[PDB]
Amino acid sequence: SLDREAQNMVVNKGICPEDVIPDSLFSFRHTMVLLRRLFPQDSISSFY
Amino acid sequence: EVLAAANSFAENYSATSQDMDLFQTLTSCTFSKEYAWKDFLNGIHCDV
Numbered sequence: 326s327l328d329r330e331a332q333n334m335v336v337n338k339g340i341c342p343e344d345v346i347p348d349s350l351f352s353f354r355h356t357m358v359l360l361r362r363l364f365p366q367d368s369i370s371s372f373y
Numbered sequence: 374e375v376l377a378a379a380n381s382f383a384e385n386y387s388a389t390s391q392d393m394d395l396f397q398t399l400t401s402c403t404f405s406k407e408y409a410w411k412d413f414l415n416g417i418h419c420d421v
Contacts, residue, residue, distance in 0.1 A: 349377035354384075 343353055
């Protein structure tokens with residue numbers, strides 16, 4: 326039910342994946358730097 | 374949740390010309406009498 330809910334809110338109006346706040350104690354900057362440091366990824370794909 | 378949203382908005386906020394114009398209006402003219410009162414209060418140092 327919530328999967329269809331989220332899919333409909335994303336299709337009907339585009340929402341950038343930065344303004345989505347899972348909970349009030351969630352920080353986008355910190356979470357993303359923690360995740361990249363934890364799981365390294367290739368930068369050539371992002372740049373080339 | 375309101376405080377978290379306020380933090381998120383104020384974090385990635387870049388001041389535009391129109392916002393600075395509005396804030397300059399607010400601080401310079403529409404709040405003039407109150408600031409006059411506050412500036413008067415300082416400078417009334419009193420002795421015993």
